[PDB]
Amino acid sequence: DKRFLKLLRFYILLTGIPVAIGITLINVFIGEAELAEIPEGYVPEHWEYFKHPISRWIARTFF
Amino acid sequence: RWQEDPEPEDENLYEKNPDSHGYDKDPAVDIWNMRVVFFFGFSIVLVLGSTFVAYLPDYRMQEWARREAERLVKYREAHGLPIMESNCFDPSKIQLPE
Amino acid sequence: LLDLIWLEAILPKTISLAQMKASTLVTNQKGLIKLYFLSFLITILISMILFNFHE
Amino acid sequence: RQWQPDVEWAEQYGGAVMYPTKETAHWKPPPWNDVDPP
Amino acid sequence: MLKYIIPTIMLMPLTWLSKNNMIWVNSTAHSLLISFTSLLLMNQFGDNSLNFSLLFFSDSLSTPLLILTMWLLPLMLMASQHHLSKENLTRKKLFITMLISLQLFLIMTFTAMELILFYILFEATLVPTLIIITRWGNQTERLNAGLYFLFYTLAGSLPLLVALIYIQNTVGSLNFLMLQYWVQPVHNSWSNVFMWLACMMAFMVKMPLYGLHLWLPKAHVEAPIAGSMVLAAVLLKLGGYGMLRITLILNPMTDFMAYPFIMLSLWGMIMTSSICLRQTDLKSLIAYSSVSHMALVIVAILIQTPWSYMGATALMIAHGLTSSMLFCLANSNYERIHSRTMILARGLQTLLPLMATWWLLASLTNLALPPTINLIGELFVVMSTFSWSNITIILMGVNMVITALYSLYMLIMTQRGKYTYHINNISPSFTRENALMSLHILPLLLLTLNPKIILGPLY
Amino acid sequence: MNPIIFIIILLTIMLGTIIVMISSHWLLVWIGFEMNMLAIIPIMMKNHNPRATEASTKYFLTQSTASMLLMMAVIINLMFSGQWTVMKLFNPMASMLMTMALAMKLGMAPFHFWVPEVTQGIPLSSGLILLTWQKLAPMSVLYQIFPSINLNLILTLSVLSILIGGWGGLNQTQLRKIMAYSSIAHMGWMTAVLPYNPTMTLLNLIIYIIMTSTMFTMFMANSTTTTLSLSHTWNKTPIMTVLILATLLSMGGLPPLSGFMPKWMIIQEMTKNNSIILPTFMAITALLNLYFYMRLTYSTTLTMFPSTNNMKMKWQFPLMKKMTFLPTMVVLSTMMLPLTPMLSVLE
Amino acid sequence: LQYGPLAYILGEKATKKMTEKSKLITVDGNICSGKSKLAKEIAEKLGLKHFPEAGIHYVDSTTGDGKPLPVQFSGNCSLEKFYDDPKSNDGNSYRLQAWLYASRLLQYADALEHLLSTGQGVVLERSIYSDFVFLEAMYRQGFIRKQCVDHYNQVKKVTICEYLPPHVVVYVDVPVPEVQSRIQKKGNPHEMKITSAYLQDIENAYKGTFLPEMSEKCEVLQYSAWEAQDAEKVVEDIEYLKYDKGPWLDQNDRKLHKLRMLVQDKLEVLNYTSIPVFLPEVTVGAHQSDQVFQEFTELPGRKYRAGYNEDVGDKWIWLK
Ligand SMILES: CCCCCCCCCCCCCCCCCC(=O)OC[C@H](COP(=O)([O-])OCC(O)COP(=O)([O-])OC[C@@H](COC(=O)CCCCCCCCCCCCCCCCC)OC(=O)CCCCCCCCCCCCCCCCC)OC(=O)CCCCCCCCCCCCCCCCC
Ligand SMILES: CCCCCCCCCCCCO[C@@H]1O[C@H](CO)[C@@H](O[C@H]2O[C@H](CO)[C@@H](O)[C@H](O)[C@H]2O)[C@H](O)[C@H]1O
Ligand SMILES: CCCCCCCCCCCCO[C@@H]1O[C@H](CO)[C@@H](O[C@H]2O[C@H](CO)[C@@H](O)[C@H](O)[C@H]2O)[C@H](O)[C@H]1O
Ligand SMILES: CCCCCCCCCCCCO[C@@H]1O[C@H](CO)[C@@H](O[C@H]2O[C@H](CO)[C@@H](O)[C@H](O)[C@H]2O)[C@H](O)[C@H]1O
Ligand SMILES: CCCCCCCCCCCCO[C@@H]1O[C@H](CO)[C@@H](O[C@H]2O[C@H](CO)[C@@H](O)[C@H](O)[C@H]2O)[C@H](O)[C@H]1O
Ligand SMILES: CCCCCCCCCCCCO[C@@H]1O[C@H](CO)[C@@H](O[C@H]2O[C@H](CO)[C@@H](O)[C@H](O)[C@H]2O)[C@H](O)[C@H]1O
Ligand SMILES: CCCCCCCCCCCCO[C@@H]1O[C@H](CO)[C@@H](O[C@H]2O[C@H](CO)[C@@H](O)[C@H](O)[C@H]2O)[C@H](O)[C@H]1O
Ligand SMILES: Nc1nc2c(ncn2[C@@H]2O[C@H](COP(=O)(O)OP(=O)(O)OP(=O)(O)O)[C@@H](O)[C@H]2O)c(=O)[nH]1
Ligand SMILES: N=C(N)NC(=N)NCCc1ccc(I)c(Cl)c1
Ligand SMILES: [Mg+2]
């Protein structure tokens, strides 16, 4: 039982720590988008309608 | 009434491999099976999958609708209009029977 | 009373008994040429006298 | 271990018919090679 | 959907061309990869569904059912590889192929745009499921469980085929997107009454509706562990998914045609919850518990309200993870003592402490402890049925009490008390078993953080 | 039989059928049936045992009686129309006689009694011809005269055959009797749709022939004629048990296998005609067929029956029977459903 | 081509290769009757092909690489254990006898196939026609049950009817007291446990049933232990035979073609030796039969059809 919990903890942290750090670095150094009016005669890409950089990247890459 | 093999003995994986993970009798295969389940099950699907779900781009327009409702409420109150009307459709485009 | 009995009885159990009985009726035959062709005569007679398949 | 049919289970399907009745009581399986003795 | 159908098909050659000792490692690894990619289906829009082609589409109802479907396959493989260890290689590969083909039919069933295509795949699931139960079940009664499972389903499904074909002739199309715009009201008449019954009875047997449920406890007690997991987690939800779609074209006749089935469900849930209090077979107790849980789903689908449809979707997903986990928990005991009698092995918490924790969490979800999605879905249905008729809160409330009683009776009977003296082969829990339990409960409890993704199209 | 004589007799069985299918004159249709019956008797008698003689005699009496009724219908038709053209008949009594005659030839209930007996009494290879090729000639005549057929008569025959075939097979352990009752049930489906869409009669006939030929060939491969003899296949050729299982499920009409295609298309055509009760009853009654198909799968593929010690000797020798076209037939028997729209080539 | 209707049509008829030396000869007699020695002398002198008596492992000698297989693939039938414990609870006595009839049936088909394909005669030591003398002896001594005898007669009824009897049957008559004396000199410890009642039963069945039956349809030559030493007189006796009885006179190329199609396909030969008659002696459970069949396929050159086994050196498999 002890070995399983240690293995479970290790593999969650194997990616959980890098993700937690990646999220923090994205939040601090890239930041969120700023809401703005659509400039006259401008056609935003479908992923420019979202605020958080990770959400924008998900929309641009997969959706 | 026949020639039949007796029922086999029940095997315990720990007797021959005390470090067995319960996946396979072969210790090398047993460890690799443990790793793929844990890496792909927990490190990938659960951790990245939860991250992916948390950052979905405005799932089902819920945030857009709130921003849109704020705009409509501001506009309709600045011009004395009702916040909401009982009719969904303009009655001038409806021809009642009779 | 309900789950191991009556719900079992009022459908799956009774249905299977019906088919098993009908199967014995259909297949319990004597293999006699005389009887089979005699039933052909009855069939042809019914088709005309009772059902008017000839019209 | 997993149950598999035994002789008693198999004998259900070796009779002349699947559903015994009084009428077919005397029926017997046909010859293995279809040839009835003269 | 080809990005899921084709890799699912490729799992077959991967299994057959794998080294002898790597069939379980390879199929598990790559079925987990497919499950990962299924999250891309979560691109759901507020107004329109995600319509891939003339054949397949995905909306907020099918998306969670697809993600649950593709998640279960790797879990089923982990759950099956121990009792299949003595099987010869070709038959192991055949067993895995049946599981892969089931996933292939299921993902296609949930995304089929046309109802007759849905019907064919909805029936195709019978074949692999029947083969798994009758070929790899353990006891003599698996042959009869296969027949009851097969003929109950076909008894209702053949009328559905006639009704669907009739609808296509009358309306011109069975494309679900077209039916949304071309649907016409159903006027009272004896013809429409039987059209209603033909459209719904097949799905009622799958749920199963109380009265048509006797096949389910048979199937579970005889099925192998993977057979029970898919049966309980996903196959029962075909009926609910079909009802949620077909009810579109049955209004307003469903207003009064629902009554006999609501009474069966409302009373049935109490009867089957009470039956669980006296079951002697652990697998039979859990199977009866599913009938009680799906009675709620039938009522929610039939009363046809936005809250009830959201509760049904949450309940279908929550029950799938919970019920599957309970079967895996019961199976881990079975692999030690080789019996399903609940009273045989007691006080197991003293011998398997961590496994007793999984039993606790599975029980707590089964009785719908807030804020688990089990409670969210059940609460939404209770909220909606109270508006349907205030008196229903008495039946819903009573069922809550009995559900807690039998969930904890199961926990107290097997985990607490004194261990059976003569049982001395309770070996410590394997990593495989502990991982299997955690891959059920962890996604279940995580979903509490973001319930909206399992609340369906009415959200 | 001398091999060249066997070939010449088979070519005459085929020629008799072909004459029926290409004839425009009722006399030549009658000749086609006479020639076909002349050549089929020797292949039933080829094993010279009392059971074969009884089967040939029972077969001869049934088919000779049917051909006499057919000639009677032809002559009545000549009297009331003064012509021999193969087409709709010009007198209702002629139509009843011709329809009844062809029902006797097809072995449809209540003229079915001979089919299980004759099939049981002749070798498997002879039974394969009797239950497949022999259906072609009567079906091709029904295809041409259906506009004049009495709707009540033909649908009554179809309903009886579906019921009798389904109930009769439940009590059978002999594989040749099972196939015979399965044939009667399937003939019912073919003729139920004939009044509405003849093309669906052809589709059901073609798929039925393919599946029946697959079953008979698979029985011949191992020389099995009883349920228990077939239950030993798992201990000799495991692959065959899987092919038997798939073919039987297809014959049961389960999706997504090929045998679901004709029942699906026949239900469609009838519903387009506002025939709802009849297709529903037929589909439910066909569950009887699925039951004794599934019983065979249980004792063949899904469980392992007891074996004998002498089976070990058979392990050392390969299957030397021809099994002509079997790999192709089994694939068509099971995997054709995605190609269903191809049925229009029969239009 | 492989023999078949086409080869038959293209001129390959049995009567073209057959002569007056195309004969089937079987040597019978009790145990330790010198029948094996005489069988080799008739064969070599007459120019025929000698078949040693079919034993437990005969089928192995004709398939694979010809070496005997582990006993488990013969069902653990043992002739030694039959002498030690003829009344063993395992049912070894009848299981052995049922196995031996099948082996003889296969050998008889082999011998007939050799005769029809080449026209050369063959010499056999006992055959399916005389196999029952051992079954009768076992029953009379209480070694097998009456149900076993019924199974044996069922299998024999639907198998023997297909074949033709020997042209010549040769019987070497040796009284039981001398057989019991010769067994001692041969000095096999297991065979030394045989009793005279068993031997007398074999003698009775031979004289009471076999020879009277074989005379009505074959040529029977009976010799004493002394007379059988002079093989040349025996070979002289055979050559002056008339052959005016038995079915062989009624055969033609058409009937012999049908016979050759049967005997060349061994699975068709052994079809009824495994009729589904659930006798405890010969019935094998599913678990045991599955396990043993799996081991068989793992033996060298036994997984695939002959010629498709890379593990024993077969080549060009991707073009075969
Ligand atoms: C990573 C970054 C990137 C993201 C990727 C993420 C990917 C997912 C990974 C995350 C999951 C990782 C988990 C594995 C880590 C390794 C674990 C380990 O090593 O130790 C093993 C661990 C302890 O080690 P051990 O003692 O040596 O084990 C031996 C025994 O088996 C031990 O047995 P035991 O008997 O001693 O204990 C068993 C059980 C027995 O106890 C019970 O079950 C009683 C249940 C009581 C019900 C209480 C009602 C629910 C209250 C919470 C509801 C939420 C709303 C509340 C209001 C607002 C809250 C803010 O106890 C518990 O489970 C603890 C209960 C904790 C929940 C109760 C509330 C906690 C306080 C409130 C939380 C506040 C939120 C956080 C703060 C917010 C700011 C961030 O034992 C286990 O195996 C348990 C594993 C299962 C953990 C469940 C976690 C689920 C996730 C949370 C979802 C929350 C949703 C709400 C659900 C409410 C529950 C019904
Ligand atoms: C926790 C681990 C998760 C792993 C998956 C996510 C990996 C990628 C995370 C963030 C990637 C960078 O995210 C991206 O940043 C830039 C801003 O710098 C944005 O890009 C936008 O701003 C830049 C300015 O920098 C301009 O060129 C322009 O206006 C536009 O392209 C994108 O809209 C956003 O999607
Ligand atoms: C909604 C309508 C659905 C229609 C579906 C129709 C499917 C019918 C399938 C055929 C059923 C026949 O199945 C047959 O039934 C009978 C009665 O139960 C069973 O009979 C069994 O139980 C009865 C009572 O103990 C005994 O008399 C009998 O000796 C025993 O074999 C047979 O074992 C079974 O082979
Ligand atoms: C004319 C068109 C025909 C198209 C055919 C295209 C594919 C042709 C493939 C030919 C090569 C197959 O190779 C053959 O199969 C398997 C799978 O590799 C090999 O051996 C296999 O053994 C086991 C399982 O069987 C595993 O370790 C692994 O799957 C493989 O090593 C065989 O030893 C080889 O003889
Ligand atoms: C839960 C996590 C899911 C993990 C899924 C694992 C499988 C990953 C599949 C990768 C798919 C990438 O697909 C590829 O990406 C590029 C961007 O780089 C995209 O290329 C283009 O697509 C979008 C629209 O589709 C365009 O508006 C945009 O200009 C561009 O990004 C395409 O979508 C595709 O060409
Ligand atoms: C409500 C819509 C769906 C209804 C479907 C109902 C049709 C029947 C489905 C099950 C068919 C199983 O087919 C047959 O059924 C009967 C009972 O029913 C079983 O019969 C079983 O119980 C009977 C007595 O109760 C015993 O005598 C028998 O030994 C036992 O097998 C057979 O073992 C099974 O072969
Ligand atoms: C678990 C099983 C559940 C079973 C549920 C059973 C539901 C019963 C529904 C009863 C209503 C049936 O549908 C009802 O039938 C009657 C005929 O009798 C129809 O009556 C129609 O034809 C009659 C002819 O006499 C006219 O007089 C009447 O004006 C007209 O409405 C109604 O149009 C329809 O409202
Ligand atoms: N139970 C049984 N034993 C048999 C059978 N055929 C041979 N045997 C045994 O095989 C052994 C040798 O058989 P024999 O050929 O007759 O004796 P031999 O040693 O070869 O001496 P010769 O007669 O001169 O050839 C004897 O112990 C027989 O009992 C048989 O059909 N059944
Ligand atoms: N005789 C019938 N009952 N039906 C029928 N064949 N109708 C004719 C309609 C039709 C359908 C498909 C095609 I392709 C074509 Cl050319 C014609
Ligand atoms: Mg010797």
Curated annotation (Swiss-Prot), chain B:
Keywords: Electron transport, Membrane, Mitochondrion, Mitochondrion inner membrane, Respiratory chain, Transit peptide, Transmembrane, Transmembrane helix, Transport. Belongs to the complex I NDUFB11 subunit family. The chain holds residues 54 to 151 of 154 of the full protein. It is a single-pass membrane protein. Complex I is composed of 45 different subunits. Interacts with BCAP31. This is NADH dehydrogenase [ubiquinone] 1 beta subcomplex subunit 11, mitochondrial. Residues 1-24 are annotated as: Disordered. The keyword Transport applies. Accessory subunit of the mitochondrial membrane respiratory chain NADH dehydrogenase (Complex I), that is believed not to be involved in catalysis. Complex I functions in the transfer of electrons from NADH to the respiratory chain. The immediate electron acceptor for the enzyme is believed to be ubiquinone. The gene is NDUFB11. Residues 13-24 have a biased composition (Basic and acidic residues). It is found in: Mitochondrion inner membrane. GO terms for cellular component: mitochondrial inner membrane; mitochondrion; respiratory chain complex I. It comes from Bos taurus. The chain crosses the membrane at residues 36-56.
From Swiss-Prot, chain D:
The modification N6-acetyllysine is found at residue 28. It is found in: Mitochondrion inner membrane. It comes from the Eukaryota. Belongs to the complex I 49 kDa subunit family. Core subunit of respiratory chain NADH dehydrogenase (Complex I) which is composed of 45 different subunits. Component of the iron-sulfur (IP) fragment of the enzyme. Interacts with NDUFAF3. Interacts with NDUFAF7. Interacts with CERS2. Core subunit of the mitochondrial membrane respiratory chain NADH dehydrogenase (Complex I) which catalyzes electron transfer from NADH through the respiratory chain, using ubiquinone as an electron acceptor. Essential for the catalytic activity and assembly of complex I. Redox-sensitive, critical component of the oxygen-sensing pathway in the pulmonary vasculature which plays a key role in acute pulmonary oxygen-sensing and hypoxic pulmonary vasoconstriction. Plays an important role in carotid body sensing of hypoxia. This is NADH dehydrogenase [ubiquinone] iron-sulfur protein 2, mitochondrial. It comes from Bos taurus (Bovine). The lineage of its organism: Eukaryota, Metazoa, Chordata, Craniata, Vertebrata.
Swiss-Prot record, chain F:
Its EC number is 7.1.1.2. GO terms for cellular component: mitochondrial inner membrane; respiratory chain complex I. GO terms for molecular function: NADH dehydrogenase (ubiquinone) activity. Belongs to the complex I subunit 2 family. It catalyses: a ubiquinone + NADH + 5 H(+)(in) = a ubiquinol + NAD(+) + 4 H(+)(out). The modification N-formylmethionine is found at residue 1. It is found in: Mitochondrion inner membrane. It is a multi-pass membrane protein. The keyword Translocase applies. The chain crosses the membrane at residues 3-23, 25-45, 67-87, 96-116, 122-142, 145-165, 178-198, 200-220, 239-259, 274-294, 325-345. Core subunit of respiratory chain NADH dehydrogenase (Complex I) which is composed of 45 different subunits. Interacts with TMEM242. Keywords: Electron transport, Formylation, Membrane, Mitochondrion, Mitochondrion inner membrane, NAD, Respiratory chain, Translocase, Transmembrane, Transmembrane helix, Transport, Ubiquinone. The keyword Transmembrane helix applies. This is NADH-ubiquinone oxidoreductase chain 2. One of its GO terms (biological process) is mitochondrial respiratory chain complex I assembly. Pfam families: NADH_dehy_S2_C (PF06444), Proton_antipo_M (PF00361). Core subunit of the mitochondrial membrane respiratory chain NADH dehydrogenase (Complex I) which catalyzes electron transfer from NADH through the respiratory chain, using ubiquinone as an electron acceptor. Essential for the catalytic activity and assembly of complex I.
Curated annotation (Swiss-Prot), chain G:
The lineage of its organism: Eukaryota, Metazoa, Chordata, Craniata, Vertebrata. The modification N6-succinyllysine is found at residue 87. The modification Phosphoserine is found at residue 215. Accessory subunit of the mitochondrial membrane respiratory chain NADH dehydrogenase (Complex I), that is believed not to be involved in catalysis. Complex I functions in the transfer of electrons from NADH to the respiratory chain. The immediate electron acceptor for the enzyme is believed to be ubiquinone. It comes from Bos taurus (Bovine). One of its GO terms (cellular component) is cytoplasm. Belongs to the complex I NDUFA10 subunit family. This is NADH dehydrogenase [ubiquinone] 1 alpha subcomplex subunit 10, mitochondrial. It is found in: Mitochondrion matrix. Its cofactor is FAD. The modification N6-acetyllysine is found at residue 87. CDD domains: NDUO42.
